[PDB]
Design a protein around this ligand. Sequence first.
Ligand SMILES: [Mg+2]
Ligand SMILES: [Mg+2]
Ligand SMILES: [Mg+2]
Ligand SMILES: [Mg+2]
Ligand SMILES: [Mg+2]
Ligand SMILES: [Mg+2]
Ligand SMILES: [Mg+2]
Ligand SMILES: [Mg+2]
Ligand SMILES: [Mg+2]
Ligand SMILES: [Mg+2]
Ligand SMILES: [Mg+2]
Ligand SMILES: [Mg+2]
Ligand SMILES: [Mg+2]
Ligand SMILES: [Mg+2]
Ligand SMILES: [Mg+2]
Ligand SMILES: [Mg+2]
Ligand SMILES: [Mg+2]
Ligand SMILES: [Mg+2]
Ligand SMILES: [Mg+2]
Ligand SMILES: [Mg+2]
Ligand SMILES: [Mg+2]
Ligand SMILES: [Mg+2]
Ligand SMILES: [Mg+2]
Ligand SMILES: [Mg+2]
Ligand SMILES: [Mg+2]
Ligand SMILES: [Mg+2]
Ligand SMILES: [Mg+2]
Ligand SMILES: [Mg+2]
Ligand SMILES: [Mg+2]
Ligand SMILES: [Mg+2]
Lengths: 176, 159, 187, 50, 49, 104
Amino acid sequence: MKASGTLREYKVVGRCLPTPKCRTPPLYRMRIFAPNHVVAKSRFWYFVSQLKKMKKSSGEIVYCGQVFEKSPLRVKNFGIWLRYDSRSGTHNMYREYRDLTTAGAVTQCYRDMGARHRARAHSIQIMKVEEIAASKCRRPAVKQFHDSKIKFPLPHRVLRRQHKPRFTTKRPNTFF
Amino acid sequence: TNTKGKRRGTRYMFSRPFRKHGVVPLATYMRIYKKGDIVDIKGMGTVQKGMPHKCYHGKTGRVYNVTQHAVGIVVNKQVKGKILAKRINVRIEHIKHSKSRDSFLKRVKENDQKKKEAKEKGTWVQLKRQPAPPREAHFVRTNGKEPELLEPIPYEFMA
Amino acid sequence: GVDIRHNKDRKVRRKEPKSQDIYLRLLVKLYRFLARRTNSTFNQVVLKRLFMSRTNRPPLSLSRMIRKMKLPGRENKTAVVVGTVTDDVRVQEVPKLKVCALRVTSRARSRILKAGGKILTFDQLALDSPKGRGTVLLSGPRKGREVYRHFGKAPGTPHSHTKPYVRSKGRKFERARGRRASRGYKN
Amino acid sequence: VSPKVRKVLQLLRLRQIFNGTFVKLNKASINMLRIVEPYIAWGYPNLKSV
Amino acid sequence: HFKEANNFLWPFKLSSPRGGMKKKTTHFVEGGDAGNREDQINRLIRRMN
Amino acid sequence: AKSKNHTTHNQSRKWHRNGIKKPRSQRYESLKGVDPKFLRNMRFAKKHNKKGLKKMQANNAKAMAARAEAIKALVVSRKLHRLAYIAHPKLGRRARARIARGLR
RNA sequence: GUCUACGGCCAUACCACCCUGAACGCGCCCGAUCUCGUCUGAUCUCGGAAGCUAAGCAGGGUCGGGCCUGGUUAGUACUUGGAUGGGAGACCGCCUGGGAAUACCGGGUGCUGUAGGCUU
RNA sequence: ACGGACCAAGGAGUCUAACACGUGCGCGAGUCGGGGGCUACGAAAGCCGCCGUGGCGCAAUGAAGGUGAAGGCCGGCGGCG
RNA sequence: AGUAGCUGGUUCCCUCCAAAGUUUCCCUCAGGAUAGCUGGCGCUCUCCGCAGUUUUAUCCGGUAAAGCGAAUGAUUAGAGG
RNA sequence: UGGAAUGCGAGUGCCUAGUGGGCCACUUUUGGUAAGCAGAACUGGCGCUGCGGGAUGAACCGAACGCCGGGUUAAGGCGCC
RNA sequence: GCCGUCGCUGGCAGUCGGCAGAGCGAGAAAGAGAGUGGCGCGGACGCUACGCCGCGACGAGUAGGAGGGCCGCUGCGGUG
RNA sequence: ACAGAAACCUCCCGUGGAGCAGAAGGGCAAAAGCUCGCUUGAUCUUGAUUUUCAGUACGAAUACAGACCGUGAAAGCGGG
Ligand SMILES: [Mg+2]
Ligand SMILES: [Mg+2]
Ligand SMILES: [Mg+2]
Ligand SMILES: [Mg+2]
Ligand SMILES: [Mg+2]
Ligand SMILES: [Mg+2]
Ligand SMILES: [Mg+2]
Ligand SMILES: [Mg+2]
Ligand SMILES: [Mg+2]
Ligand SMILES: [Mg+2]
Ligand SMILES: [Mg+2]
Ligand SMILES: [Mg+2]
Ligand SMILES: [Mg+2]
Ligand SMILES: [Mg+2]
Ligand SMILES: [Mg+2]
Ligand SMILES: [Mg+2]
Ligand SMILES: [Mg+2]
Ligand SMILES: [Mg+2]
Ligand SMILES: [Mg+2]
Ligand SMILES: [Mg+2]
Ligand SMILES: [Mg+2]
Ligand SMILES: [Mg+2]
Ligand SMILES: [Mg+2]
Ligand SMILES: [Mg+2]
Ligand SMILES: [Mg+2]
Ligand SMILES: [Mg+2]
Ligand SMILES: [Mg+2]
Ligand SMILES: [Mg+2]
Ligand SMILES: [Mg+2]
Ligand SMILES: [Mg+2]
């Protein structure tokens, strides 16, 4: 995988193939995060193959749809249960994020395992994402925003568009 | 450099299978071969007379000659740039009737049949083999229980 | 770039005769016209044979033209050849034959005309039957040349009845080792 | 190019980069588009694309 | 008569992908270009044809 | 002065420059190799196949005269189906004339 | 239902121990003049028919050993092709396809050809 | 790694014999005068056939003595049966 | 003008096709002969066949793995007789 | 109903030069502590081959070449050179 | 766009003119066929056929091979 | 009984754990081993074929065919 752009949040179901023995097999829903459905079905088969004795050839994808967000206008607290590999071993993690969308928080989790642990998009394995109540969060980087009268200034407003006035008379101001 | 022995490198090829040693069955000797039979070679190591050279064990060929205890067959040999047609006198114990042509024959007679019929009813039947086509569209009934939800398992250093 | 192979791009057929004679380069003009302007695949074969070398259009014998024109059905037809019609002194009776060849030896003109046959040319044929209706194409034996006896599997090889190149043939010219089962071996 | 991939890219008539062709799918065809997978980028064309 | 209709068509010669390939040497599921991009072949056709 | 001892590196490509071709499959393959006694009797069978000729016609012409009493005993839309008939150079000649006359 | 002769595939048939075998057979058994062979009629060959299923043989049994066939092992190990993937390497992950073997846990324990008997 | 300061002229797959294949030409089961002879360029060209001796081709095979390249049906006679 | 499997040179343009350092034999290992790869000339047909490919049937094989409560060989430890 | 798919005109014959020192890479792989070491297998290259990238470079990534105009790319890139 | 090679074994002798009638690109094997009865005197170019014309595809190259040179050097038979 | 670790006799178990001239591998149980009986297929002679291979030889080998033979009641087997 490669966490291109922003990840979408896909809901893929899929079943094994019908046979004389199992006239109808059970369907199997998964909750994939991937750039597009073509990568979502391939991670659906990666997972189903790592859990059930089932391959892409021996089965079929019954439905691959994108599941939107139920409240993309409410700041939420998502908690994710990672599973990744380093240069030496493989570890489970649990990271929390404040975001509006679940796929948003998962994109932020891929960019965060990339930043902090240099974990490429193919080592990571999201195993559970869950919207958490603000009073169940644990990371102090996310509990610190659970204030009703929050208040802070933007203290060092570094000048951007450094090249539109590229040659100027006055010197830039940073207090605002 | 290796040796050019007639039987170098046949310790497993010419050995008998597990618990299949001893006397050779007699259906091997009481079955018939006629010029034109597609025969495949498998050197049996029990009988040593008329053993086919190791470079033919596993090839298929057709018979062109028949003597008392042995036939003569024409197997193709890939020799370093080209595929010669070689004529070997393999004894009977190193031979099976290859069931490859068989299915073609049981399809030929099935075609001649299904063409004999469907000729008086004016219809048109399919006589060619078509490749396994892309599977057509179907409904998957999810009667009652919704699809079970799967998710990866955590890691367990069970080493 | 494209991944084709130009090993065989140049087809090696003869676009024209290699000779420079002008009684052949006029026949080839007339028949190249008939070949392209008619839909008869006869003229195309005559044209394609007027190119061929002197070893690819061999001579015909009068006797082989007899037995190839005696075959049932092909009566009152004109026997077309592109090579020459040599005599065959070992045949005693000659019927009447309508013939058309490039050359007819001065002792086969005699026999054919004394029989009572006609000896056309390729221009006379092209005027008689342009599309070549009523003809019998023939060609002498091509493997008749003594050259084709040295070709094949090299001598000294199991079951290769190929003639070797020897200065003279005699008792002591290549009869000793690769031929006697006694002295060495034989194939 | 490997020889097995160069024989299949020429039974698909793709003898040149950015060449394209249409291919009907079955077992014997998908199993060739699997052999030549690293050399092609194939898919299911729309009607406007045809 | 698909075999005959598709074989009557000289194989199409397309220009370079306007915009540009993502990565030529890796499968489409690896954030690249190769392989099968079932629905998304048309986005490439529009920028290549 | 040690030189490379053996290799097969370019060989599998020289073999294919002129292809690897299966042998020339002809009908009527040779009879060399077949056992003598059998191939000695097959020659006595051919040498005498003519001995039963005048009896073979008496049956071939028989079942060929019987071939007489054998055989002489038995003896997508309406629119685009009519347009594909008017537009036939031969079959539609009169449906086309019926239209040409139509404008008079 | 089953047995004899000759068999086919040669353990689902083999191995151990135990139980039951009506009828015909199959057997054990009784002899050595004759055929034949030995130290020895034990074996072999020969002439028999008083005796008996004791044994061979048949059928069945055993939380049987084995064999046969399934599941788990396991989409694991391994693996074709791919990347300017990771790692200092040792090796490792991922895409595209194929895909095992123990231990462990279940089921089964000879089908069958021609000829001829018994079960009238 | 070796040759090379500069410029000019000279400088290296030739000819004969033999063989093989391809090709053009004439005649063609024949073919060829090459040796000989006859009648400025000309030492050329032309001609000879009772000058075709001879070469090669038209027959091979065997060490040799030698041998040396479709047959079938029909009656009539003798023989076996 | 001795021979040299050894060293050095080997003279004009364009167009087209285009390699090998491999097999076997050699008092052969700085070289040949041979098969391969190459080019040239073609010819017989076309205007069924073939394939460095897959599909479907069908055989083949003892590597990767795995195994040692399975044979051979190696090999740690207790326990019960 | 020419009996799977896809593709493509095939078959055959002479004559034949150069070559017979090779080297590198992924993967498998033998000797060696290892080596820009010695030795094999498969495929692709360099040799015989330019071009864009890797500052530089026989072999790495892209891509193979008639001479030109416009457009777009690959692999690599976009402080300045 | 231009040059060249290859292929189409492509097309053109039809310049058939007051002895005239100007065609063979069109999806569908084959005749702009014969007969038998119900004024003004006019019309470009071409065709060294070893020539001319039209279509596509292609174009690396050492050793080596082949072709084409209206490339060049010196003499000979002809001819300007 | 003497007789012992080990002589010789006897019963039982015994898939080969022995043996088959040698190196190793393969194969072999009313046998390919062990012991007897008869013997000389270890003879004469055509070609085909496989192995190394150039697909040339030698060596070796496999299938036949024609003779003569051995063996066994025979089917058969045998030209090392
Ligand atoms: Mg090009
Ligand atoms: Mg080239
Ligand atoms: Mg742009
Ligand atoms: Mg690559
Ligand atoms: Mg060498
Ligand atoms: Mg009772
Ligand atoms: Mg007794
Ligand atoms: Mg008992
Ligand atoms: Mg020097
Ligand atoms: Mg100097
Ligand atoms: Mg000079
Ligand atoms: Mg000549
Ligand atoms: Mg000299
Ligand atoms: Mg060529
Ligand atoms: Mg030397
Ligand atoms: Mg040197
Ligand atoms: Mg091995
Ligand atoms: Mg292992
Ligand atoms: Mg050298
Ligand atoms: Mg090396
Ligand atoms: Mg070295
Ligand atoms: Mg070199
Ligand atoms: Mg090259
Ligand atoms: Mg290059
Ligand atoms: Mg660098
Ligand atoms: Mg440009
Ligand atoms: Mg730069
Ligand atoms: Mg070039
Ligand atoms: Mg015995
Ligand atoms: Mg005999």
